[PDB]
Design a protein around this ligand. Structure first.
Ligand SMILES: CNC(=O)C1(Cc2ccccc2F)CC1
Length: 119
């Protein structure tokens, strides 16, 4: 029932994601000079270094907010490269499955702790 436990759990899951080779294209913002039409398609760029920095700055109130930003990394990649046969699409699907598999208990434990607090 630890209301704060999600933060270190998210730091550890981000460490695992950075160690995955599938995270390479997502570790820093998409270079706005290599893909000059990126902002024509993507309104809100997102990447794992921005997520880690937002978490470390104390600028997420809950793991649901972190989860929303991570899901935005994958929806941005699917919008910019829609081909299910592209290198980035297949890496996105694998990394997203890994992330969702691990974030599920973090969200459940956080929500359970808040319900216990307000019992
Ligand atoms: C998340 N990155 C992307 O969406 C792009 C760049 C990119 C894709 C694949 C591998 C290296 C890469 F640099 C297409 C813009």
């Amino acid at each position: 029932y630890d209301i704060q436990a999600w933060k270190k759990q998210c730091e550890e899951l981000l460490n695992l994601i950075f160690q995955c080779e599938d995270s390479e294209p997502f570790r820093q913002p998409v270079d706005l000079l290599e893909y000059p039409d990126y902002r024509d398609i993507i309104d809100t760029p997102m990447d794992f270094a921005t997520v880690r920095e937002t978490l470390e700055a104390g600028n997420y109130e809950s793991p649901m907010e972190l989860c929303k930003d991570v899901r935005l990394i994958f929806s941005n990649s699917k919008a910019y490269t829609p081909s299910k046969r592209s290198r980035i699409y297949s890496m996105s699907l694998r990394l997203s499955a890994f992330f969702e598999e691990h974030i599920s208990s973090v969200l459940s434990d956080y929500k359970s702790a808040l319900r216990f607090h307000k019992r």
